[PDB]
């Protein structure tokens, strides 16, 4: 039964989160100029886990990719990367960097001459 495997893994992750929260309360630290002490430790633990989990699933998925790769992947392997790459590029426009980064006014600084004219604001 693999149910106990997932149970132990999720319990370990939950216990890591709880321990991080508890020690964050134990360790005396000024939270931040604005942020709280209830959410920041959880944000750090989210990063911690998400990193470990992403690395683990990448390792595991690439291992099973090497295991299951065959000639039948002729269109399955390349196109998939294509789509992911495509998605990535779209994710750059719609999610990460939404625009071309013009000024607040929207003057579209695009040549070094106007960059020189700009950086020297009076």
Partner 1 sequence: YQIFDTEKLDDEQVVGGHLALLGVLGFIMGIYYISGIQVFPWGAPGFHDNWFYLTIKPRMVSLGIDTYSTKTADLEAAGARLLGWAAFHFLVGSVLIFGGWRHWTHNLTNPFTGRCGNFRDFRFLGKFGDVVFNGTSAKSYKEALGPHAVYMSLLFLGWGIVMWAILGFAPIPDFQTINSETFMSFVFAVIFFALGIYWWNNPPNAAIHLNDDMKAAFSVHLTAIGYINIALGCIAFVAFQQPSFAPYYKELDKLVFYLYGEPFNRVSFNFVEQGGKVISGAKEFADFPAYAILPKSGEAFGMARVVTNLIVFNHIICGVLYVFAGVYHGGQYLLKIQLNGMYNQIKSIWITKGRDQEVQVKILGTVMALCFATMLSVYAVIVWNTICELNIFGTNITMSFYWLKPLPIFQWMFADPSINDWVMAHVITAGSLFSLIALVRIAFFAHTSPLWDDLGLKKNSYSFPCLGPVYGGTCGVSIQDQLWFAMLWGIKGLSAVCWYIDGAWIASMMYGVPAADAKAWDSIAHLHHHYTSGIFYYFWTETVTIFSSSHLSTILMIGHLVWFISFAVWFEDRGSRLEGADIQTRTIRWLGKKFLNRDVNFRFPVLTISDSKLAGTFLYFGGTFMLVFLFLANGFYQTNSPLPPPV
Ligand X SMILES: CCCCCCCCCCCC(=O)OC[C@H]1O[C@H](OC(C)(C)CCC\C(C)=C/C=C/C(C)=C/C=C/C(C)=C/C=C/C=C(C)/C=C/C=C(C)/C=C/c2c(C)ccc(C)c2C)[C@H](O)[C@@H](O)[C@@H]1O
Which of 46, 59, 68, 87 is close enough to bind ligand G2O by CB under 6 A? 59
**Interaction of residue 71 with partner 1, rule CB under 8 A:** yes
Q: Which stretch binds ligand LHG (CB under 6 A): 1-9, 38-46, 82-90, 108-116?
A: 1-9
- Residue 21 and residue 42 in contact, taking contact as beta carbons nearer than 8 Å: yes
Tell me which residue has its CB nearest to ligand LHG: 5
Q: Which residue lies nearer to partner 1 by CB, 26 or 122?
A: 26
- Is 1 a binding residue for ligand LHG by CB under 6 A? The answer is yes
Tell the residue number behind the tokens 């625009």, with chain if given.
Answer: 99
Residues of span 67-96 touching ligand X by CB under 6 A? 67
Rg (CA), the chain: 24
Instruction: Report in angstroms how near the CB of residue 70 gets to ligand LHG at its nearest.
Output: 18
DSSP state letter for 121? -
**Does 27 sit near ligand LHG (CB under 6 A)?**
no
Q: State the DSSP string of 22-83.
A: HHHHHS-----SS--TTTHHHHHHHHHHHHHHHHHHHHHHHHHHHHH--GGGTTHHHHHHHH
- Residues in contact with ligand G2O by CB under 6 A are 55, 58-59
């Amino acid at each position: 039964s693999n149910g106990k495997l997932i149970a132990l893994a999720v319990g370990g992750a939950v216990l890591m989160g709880a321990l991080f929260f508890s020690v964050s309360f134990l360790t005396g630290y000024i939270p931040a100029p604005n942020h709280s002490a209830i959410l920041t430790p959880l944000r750090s633990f989210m990063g911690w886990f998400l990193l470990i989990f992403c690395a683990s699933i990448i390792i595991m998925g690439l291992g099973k990719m090497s295991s299951a790769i065959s000639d039948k992947w002729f269109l399955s392997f390349p196109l998939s990367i294509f789509v992911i790459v495509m998605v990535m590029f779209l994710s750059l426009r719609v999610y990460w960097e939404k625009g071309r980064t013009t000024t607040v006014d929207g003057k579209y600084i695009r040549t070094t001459a106007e960059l020189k004219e700009f950086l020297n604001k009076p």
